[PDB]
Design a protein around this ligand. Structure first.
Ligand SMILES: CO[C@H]1/C=C/O[C@@]2(C)Oc3c(C)c(O)c4c(O)c(c(C=O)c(O)c4c3C2=O)NC(=O)/C(C)=C\C=C\[C@H](C)[C@H](O)[C@@H](C)[C@@H](O)[C@@H](C)[C@H](OC(C)=O)[C@@H]1C
Ligand SMILES: CCCCCCCCCCCCO[C@@H]1O[C@H](CO)[C@@H](O[C@H]2O[C@H](CO)[C@@H](O)[C@H](O)[C@H]2O)[C@H](O)[C@H]1O
Ligand SMILES: CCCCCCCCCC(=O)OC[C@H](CO)OC(=O)CCCCCCCCC
Ligand SMILES: CCCCCCCCCC[N+](C)(C)[O-]
Lengths: 154, 1034, 48
């Protein structure tokens, strides 16, 4: 009951309702049909405060959807620098692979997020990590024609 | 003019006959409908893209069409939806008075030249351009009881053996099929396809080649070899006609000679074009026809004709197939007419009894009994001339006018009966003198009442159209009543009324009538004594008048606003809303609980539950459903507990328990296009290409700020769908080109299998129907199934989708809205208790000016029209007062006296407001038109008192107080007669509990209450006004 | 072109004719489908 109310609130970005739901004992491992926890949603929609509030209320930082994607993927992909740092602080698997073999570095590189790629690298991201197509974050940077990102990954 | 027809009563009779024949002729020919055309002309462009997401539809269809909607005349605004059901609907709403045929032809013409820019798939499906309408005459439901037929089976029969015959029926405009006819459904198996190295591309290529009409030529065609004996048409390949034939379609011959047919790699059956919408009627599979009334057709005749045609189809129905009527306006429209004819007959019966009670001779009672029906019939003729229809608004327009028509009759006859009684003049000379006293006033009264009602017609938008029905009806009825009272009624009085002895006030008689005359004569002396005392202490009554004006002004604000009262129509909706990602099955489980609730707990109230899964008022996602609950007749469910109001609240409350779903019941309004009077319709607009997500954030910000003003705004909510999980799949181009797999074969294999593909047509029993190839359900359910689909490379190797694809979860819109070409989000809401709609809008505008850069706003629907129709309200109220004043000034030949009449207005309004407030009704349209008829009649009473009062002073040189007292004495009997009859005449409407009683109550309550005070107060206050006004200005 | 009257009637004439509902002042509608492939649908309207 409260779990489905947290999913909505965590996605909407309602910090006050999340606080009230954290007090009432709302399930932080509650998931939608695709396997997205409140943290997944909060990481996707870029709600920093709720990500912090969820993690300190024992939310699984390395929770994965039915396709293997973790909140760090969603945060690294949609350019949420602050959340990528807060997740990595709280023990987010930096080399986490979805079912495609795609890592948060691949996604960060794909959308040309300079700051996030450096953060992931600071926290020890396997730069030579390959997906199912044998493509590195460098291979992506060269193909996208991102000269800065290509320079960072060399 | 009265002098002319007093000497010429046969001429007068001829005019009466011509009017009656014109009226009877008009009644037989006049169209009949619940409501007339109110809403402004709208045109809906509709398209389908099988297997398309909201974004795909918007960016390939909606935007292209929108960009080409130029050079079209009298367009107010344009709105569009693009949703994941593979549907787009662009609505173009035009200026009121725009020719809907010209509006539609200009739209479809601009679309025709945009067609080459749409996808093949959309061009093939077709793009419909129709005149927008939510008003059906009835919904004919077709159900199968013995479970032998699916909804697809019923729909196909209805399409083939019903729809066309119903379309050809007399007075039937549009006919919508609730479902689709059969389609040749190829259900592909990917395991079988992979085994024979085949793809959906091969299945399509084969079906296209082996199911086609191929043009050959002729034997001995021109130019021939001269001497040719024979000229015959060459019939080559034609379209396939059966599942068996489609089964035998050759896909490949193997190396070893064995043949691969279409049946070897696919299940082949006749199915539905769409499987998204599942319709049920009390749990049983159901289709149906949505029937709309044709322009200028008779709703009663058309309904009877539709039933007569369905009766002739009864013998040919398959076993288990039954016809049901979940929605039918005809029962309502039939009662609406009977209750009006009843009111207009009862009125004449009551006038007879009142006329006899006072005047005590049958010859006198016949004159109104002739004059009123002649005027009523005449009105019908004038309605037909102006091109109006017999409908709820025009019919209740006459019910409100019966007070004015009865008065004209009473006023003329009563004044003759008095002039005879007091001066012992013969009926002829008595009528001349009687008419002499009133003829000028009746002309003045016509002009004053015209100035009251005519400006009501010149309101704009939807509300303007409604006010116009009442305006022209009441103006026409009142105008004829005056002509009849100057032509016929005089002539009838001069020839039918018998002489009365001078000073014969009926006090010489015995029994009940003798008692009454001496009792009334006493009561008349008491009245004149009372008015005598009132005219001595005027200062006090001017203070009691200002109390009434403050009390009026107070109640006017306190009384809630509405367009039309929410009536029990015998139908109401029940929304079923499951979470994002919820399936068709899960929604059906909740619909079954909703259906089960109504059929058990509301067993004595509910007749049928029409549960439509994957539907609202348009195709919705699998997570959405709706139940159209059809109730038993009002007579089979008595009291207020068995009305929609109570049933709705009880059902809505009971459905709070339901988890993993959000179920709430609600009534539909009187007319669909009005909504709520307090309600507004807001459009949040992306003006700087910000995107869907940034417009979502801006909407959330506005919804939040609106919640921080509960004092001003209530239920500020989006009229749209929230973003949902969607399966983003990325075809790697490099791996595809490296494996020799063509991107075309990949995107065809995906779209055809998973989304479905409309290939071509085939003839099933002489009807052309669609051929659809798609994956058998079990191979296109979950992401794990994606890898089971193989595409053939250039080197003939079968490559799985898993080899060249990667997938992730993302969020996206299952319904993208646009307003005037730009991305939009519709926001609904209403002014908080005790606040005006205009105030709520002003705050919504203020809160909107504090949203992110590039986020604009606009008003649409009722809000757009309320802004325009609200702008011109002051001007009409003003023009009304100025013309009324000027008309009274011409009648009395003084700038001062008019005020003596015009001061009466509040005396009628106060009682209407008290009656409506006490009863617990609303400041609705029927109430407002009721106020004008109360004001008009009370103004008529006052005009006649003041005319008599002034004429005594002017001609017989009497004093102010003397003339005034003599005037009110003469005018008491006629005022009490009209009031007694008209108050009793609308008594049934106030107490009415049955069908369409919301309108009856709204009409009668504010009229009875208004008349009770208008009558009681006017007889005491009008003399005051005349005396005070005549004093201030020498 | 190439279609016989029956084919033409099923796929064109009826498809058009069934849509010629809800037209104002339509007295009568006559049509013919030819083995030359030709369709002609004449709708005659009320006087005036
Ligand atoms: C006053 O109006 C009411 C009834 C009209 O009676 C009918 C016959 O006439 C309708 C008209 C002219 C519409 O425009 C509708 C509409 O836009 C709907 C839904 C379907 O709900 C409707 O159902 C109607 C609808 C009717 O049944 N929205 C949609 O489908 C979409 C795409 C999203 C829905 C969003 C939410 C859920 C919706 O906004 C909800 C919050 C309420 O606002 C409405 C349900 C209103 O109920 C109430 C209780 O206030 C109706 C507009
Ligand atoms: C509930 C709403 C119903 C409203 C209808 C109620 C019926 C009464 C209507 C008001 C008329 C009151 O009745 C009338 O009042 C006036 C004074 O105001 C009285 O007049 C009395 O006072 C005045 C002023 O002091 C004296 O000049 C006069 O000599 C004296 O008789 C009349 O004798 C009486 O007949
Ligand atoms: C004797 C002179 C009376 C003139 C008054 C007529 C005003 C009506 C103007 C008009 O055409 O508008 C019709 C309008 C449409 O909704 O109907 C109305 O809303 C009529 C409301 C009654 C007037 C209340 C007066 C209270 C303050 C003194
Ligand atoms: C346009 C304003 C019309 C007001 C009506 C005037 C009536 C005066 C009639 C005079 N009369 C017929 C008695 O000689």
């Amino acid at each position: 009951d409260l779990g489905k109310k947290l999913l909505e609130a965590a996605r909407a970005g309602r910090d006050d309702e999340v606080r009230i739901l954290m007090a009432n004992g709302a399930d932080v491992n509650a998931a939608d049909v695709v396997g997205w926890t409140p943290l997944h949603l909060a990481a996707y929609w870029g709600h920093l405060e709720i990500v912090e509030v969820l993690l300190k209320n024992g939310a699984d930082v390395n929770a994965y959807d039915t396709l293997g994607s973790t909140p760090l993927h969603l945060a690294a992909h949609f350019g949420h620098l602050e959340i990528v740092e807060v997740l990595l602080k709280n023990g987010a698997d930096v080399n986490a692979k979805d079912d495609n073999g795609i890592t948060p570095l691949h996604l960060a590189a794909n959308r040309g997020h300079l700051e996030i790629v450096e953060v992931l690298l600071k926290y020890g991201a396997d730069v030579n990590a390959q997906d199912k197509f044998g493509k590195t974050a460098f291979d992506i940077s060269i193909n996208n024609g991102n000269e800065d990102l290509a320079e960072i990954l060399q | 003019m009265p002098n002319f027809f007093i000497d010429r009563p046969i001429f007068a009779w001829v005019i009466a006959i011509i009017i009656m024949l014109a009226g009877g002729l008009a009644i037989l020919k006049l169209p009949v409908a619940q409501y007339p055309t109110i809403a402004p002309p709208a045109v809906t462009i509709s398209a389908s893209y099988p297997g398309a997401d909201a974004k795909t539809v918007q960016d390939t269809v909606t935007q292209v069409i929108e960009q080409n909607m130029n050079g079209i005349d009298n367009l107010m605004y344009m709105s569009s939806n693009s949703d994941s059901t593979g549907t787009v609907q662009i609505t173009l709403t035009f200026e009121s008075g725009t020719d809907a045929d010209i509006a539609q032809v200009q739209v479809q013409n601009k679309l025709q030249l945009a067609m080459p820019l749409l996808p093949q798939e959309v061009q093939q499906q077709g793009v419909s351009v129709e005149k927008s309408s939510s008003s059906f005459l009835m919904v004919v439901g077709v159900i199968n009881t013995d479970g032998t037929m699916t909804q697809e089976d019923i729909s196909d029969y209805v399409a083939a053996n019903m729809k066309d015959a119903i379309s050809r029926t007399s007075g039937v405009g549009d006919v919508q099929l609730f479902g689709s006819q059969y389609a040749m459904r190829i259900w592909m198996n990917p395991n079988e396809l992979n085994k024979f190295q085949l793809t959906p591309v091969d299945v399509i290529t084969a079906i296209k080649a082996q199911n086609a009409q191929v043009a050959a030529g002729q034997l001995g065609g021109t130019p021939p070899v001269k001497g040719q004996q024979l000229n015959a048409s060459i019939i080559a390949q034609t379209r396939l006609t059966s599942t068996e034939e489609f089964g035998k379609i050759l896909l490949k011959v193997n190396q070893d000679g064995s043949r691969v047919l279409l049946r070897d790699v696919a299940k082949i059956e006749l199915g539905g074009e769409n499987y998204d919408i599942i319709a049920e009627f009390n749990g049983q599979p159901a289709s149906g026809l949505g029937i709309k009334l044709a322009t200028g057709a008779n709703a009663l005749d058309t309904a009877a004709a539709i039933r007569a045609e369905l009766a002739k189809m009864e013998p040919f129905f398959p076993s288990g197939l039954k016809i049901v009527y979940p929605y039918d306006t005809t029962p309502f429209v039939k009662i609406s007419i009977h209750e009006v004819v009843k009111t207009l007959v009862e009125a004449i019966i009551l006038v007879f009894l009142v006329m006899y009670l006072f005047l005590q001779n049958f010859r006198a009672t016949l004159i109104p009994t002739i004059a009123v029906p002649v005027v009523l019939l005449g009105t019908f003729a004038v309605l037909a001339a102006f091109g109006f229809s017999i409908n709820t608004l025009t019919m209740f327009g006459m019910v409100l006018a019966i007070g004015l028509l009865v008065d004209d009759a009473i006023v003329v006859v009563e004044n003759v009966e008095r002039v005879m009684a007091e001066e012992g003049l013969p009926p002829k000379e008595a009528t001349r003198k009687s008419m002499g006293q009133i003829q000028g006033a009746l002309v003045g009264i016509a002009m004053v009442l015209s100035a009251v009602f005519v400006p009501m017609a010149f309101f704009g938008g939807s509300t303007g159209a409604i006010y116009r029905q009442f305006s022209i009806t009441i103006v026409s009825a009142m105008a004829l009543s005056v002509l009849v009272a100057l032509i016929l009624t005089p002539a009838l009085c001069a020839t039918m009324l018998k002489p009365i002895a001078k000073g014969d006030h009926g006090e010489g008689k015995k029994g009940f009538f003798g008692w009454f005359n001496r009792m009334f004569e006493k009561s008349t002396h008491h009245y004149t004594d009372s008015v005598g005392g009132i005219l001595r202490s005027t200062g006090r009554y001017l203070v009691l008048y200002l109390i009434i004006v403050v009390g009026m002004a107070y109640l006017f604000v306190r009384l809630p606003s509405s367009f039309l009262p929410d009536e029990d129509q015998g139908v109401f909706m029940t929304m079923v809303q499951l979470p994002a990602g919820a399936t068709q099955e899960r929604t059906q489980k909740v619909l079954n609980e909703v259906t089960h609730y109504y059929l058990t707990k509301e067993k004595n109230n509910v007749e049928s539950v029409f549960a439509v899964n994957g539907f609202g008022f348009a195709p919705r996602p699998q997570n959405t459903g709706i139940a159209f609950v059809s109730l038993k007749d009002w007579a089979d469910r008595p009291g207020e507990e068995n009305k929609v109001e109570a049933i709705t609240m009880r059902a809505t409350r009971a459905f709070s328990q339901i988890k993993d779903a959000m179920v709430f019941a609600f009534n539909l309004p009187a007319i669909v296009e009005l909504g709520t009077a307090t309600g507004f319709d807001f459009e949040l607009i992306d003006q700087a290409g910000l995107g869907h997500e940034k417009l979502t954030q801006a909407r959330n910000q506005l919804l939040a700020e609106a919640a921080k003003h509960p004092d001003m705004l209530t239920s500020v909510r989006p009229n749209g769908l929230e973003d949902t999980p969607q399966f983003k799949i990325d075809i790697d181009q490099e791996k595809a080109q490296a494996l020799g797999v063509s991107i075309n074969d990949i995107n065809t294999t995906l779209g055809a299998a998973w989304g479905g593909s409309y290939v071509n047509d085939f003839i099933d029993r002489g009807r052309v129907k669609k051929v659809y190839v798609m994956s058998e359900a079990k191979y296109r359910m979950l992401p794990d199934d994606i890898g089971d689909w193989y595409v053939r490379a250039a080197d003939g190797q079968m490559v799985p989708f898993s080899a060249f694809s990667s997938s992730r979860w993302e969020y996206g819109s299952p319904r993208l809205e646009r307003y005037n070409g730009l991305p939009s989000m519709e926001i609904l809401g209403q002014a908080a208790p005790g606040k005006s709609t205009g105030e709520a809008m002003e705050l919504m505008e203020q809160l909107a000016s504090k949203l992110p850069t590039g986020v604009g706003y606009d008003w649409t629907g009722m809000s757009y029209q309320e802004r325009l129709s609200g702008n011109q309200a002051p001007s009409l109220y003003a023009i009304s007062l100025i013309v009324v004043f000027l008309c009274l000034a011409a009648l009395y030949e003084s700038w001062s006296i008019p005020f003596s009449v015009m001061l009466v207005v509040p005396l009628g309004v106060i009682g209407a407001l008290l009656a409506a407030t006490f009863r617990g009704l609303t400041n609705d349209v029927y109430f407002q038109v009721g106020l004008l008829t109360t004001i008009g009649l009370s103004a008529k009473n006052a005009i006649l008192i003041v005319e008599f009062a002034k004429d005594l002073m002017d001609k017989e040189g009497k004093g102010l107080i003397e003339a005034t007292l003599d005037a009110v004495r003469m005018r008491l009997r006629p005022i009490l007669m009209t009031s007694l009859a008209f108050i009793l005449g609308v008594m049934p409407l106030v107490i009415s509990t049955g069908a369409g009683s919301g309108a009856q109550n709204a009409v009668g309550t504010g009229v009875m209450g208004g008349m009770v005070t208008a009558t009681v107060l006017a007889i005491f206050f009008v003399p005051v006004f005349f005396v005070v006004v005549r004093r201030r200005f020498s």
